């Protein structure tokens, strides 16, 4: 009975990404984050902009999804941040056990 989720967001810089990751570990809402640098593009005020951001995947259980969204929402510098959940199909047994323990 795997119950893992993967939530993705982006952040304006490395420091903010890692700061939020750490706060989310402190609040036991995720078991792990993986962050990396990205280049981004989107419309902003009628122009296509290029930006430099940090992305993060947050690994946690379904049970924590609500609390995680609401905490990321409160911590997020962006007025409308990208926060979304990918579907996980299977997970190594030992790893799922460790995930669950890490967010209890």
């Amino acid at each position: 009975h795997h119950h893992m989720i993967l939530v993705y967001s982006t952040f304006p810089n490395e420091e903010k990404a890692l700061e939020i990751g750490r706060k989310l570990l402190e609040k036991r809402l995720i078991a792990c984050f993986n962050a990396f640098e990205i280049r981004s593009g989107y419309w902003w005020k009628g122009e296509i902009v290029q930006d430099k951001e940090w992305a993060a995947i947050f690994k946690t259980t379904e049970e924590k999804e609500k609390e995680l969204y609401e905490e990321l929402r409160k911590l997020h510098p962006y007025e409308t941040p990208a926060i979304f959940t990918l579907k996980v199909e299977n997970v190594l047994t030992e790893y799922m056990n460790w995930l669950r323990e890490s967010v209890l």
Copy 2:
């Protein structure tokens, strides 16, 4: 009623990845891209090769999926590019609203 998708592809270099991202924003087929550098490996002509590429995730709505595949297909330098769609489970409400508006 979330209707977001995530499409992934890889590109031979940073410039091509960003160039295509921008063209896809211009054609309103995606709301956002996030690109990053990757190392890759695969079989090519009977050998295992290591390569250096740029990956991109393209965020858009289901409604745009067909047009997006066909546009990436036409723009893609690779004869057989990796283009595939990940399933998104949930999405922050404000963000889904902005996604939809960005591709209208």
Copy 3:
């Protein structure tokens, strides 16, 4: 009839990530890997730690999933590695054909 999967893991460094990718191509258990550098955070022995790792996505068919997990399990330096599978929804036809051929 797409039958592609995406399996994710993390590794202590670039060399190990690429070494395992290559061994997995040699054993024909994946068609392709894409690896990239990440910063990570998790609990370890009662503290929140920051780490520097390499992530990899491994692209393959459903048919190879079992063999892939068991091979990554045997090769993985971590005692409890993150190994999990994302659900793929659609895939470019030509690309799915190449995936299948690459792991036969």
